[PDB]
Amino acid sequence: TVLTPLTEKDYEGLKRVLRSLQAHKMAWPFLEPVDPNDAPDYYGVIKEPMDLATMEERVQRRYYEKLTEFVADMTKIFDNCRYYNPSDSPFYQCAEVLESFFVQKLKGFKASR
């Protein structure tokens, strides 16, 4: 299912999904690693940080062998955000918006495989 090996043509689809996420108006908090100057305790709280720039590096290097691994990294971004930030924080709302967008794009990618 979602465990099949990613082909080179799959990787063109993954690049497009990632670029759509990076261009979303609510993606700004996720574009780069969390700066500890903006959240001093963040890296003691979150033990597996993730961000869209790290995923872009991984896509360029063909890090992902299965689509599940790509979805797992994307899910970490949103899970870390909802765990670190309170439910009324604007950051929490950004994760809400961007995760539903990612699901919309992912369904598109899967249908096109």
- Give residues in contact with ligand WCV (CB under 6 A): 28-32, 34, 38-39, 42, 81, 84-85, 91
What whole-number distance in Å separates Cα of residue 91 and Cα of residue 66?
29
| Phi, psi dihedral angles at 86 (to 5 degrees) | -70, 160
Residues 6+ apart with CB under 8 A from 112: 13
CB of 97 to ligand WCV, least distance (A): 12
CB of 59 to ligand WCV, least distance (A): 19
CB of 102 to ligand WCV, least distance (A): 14
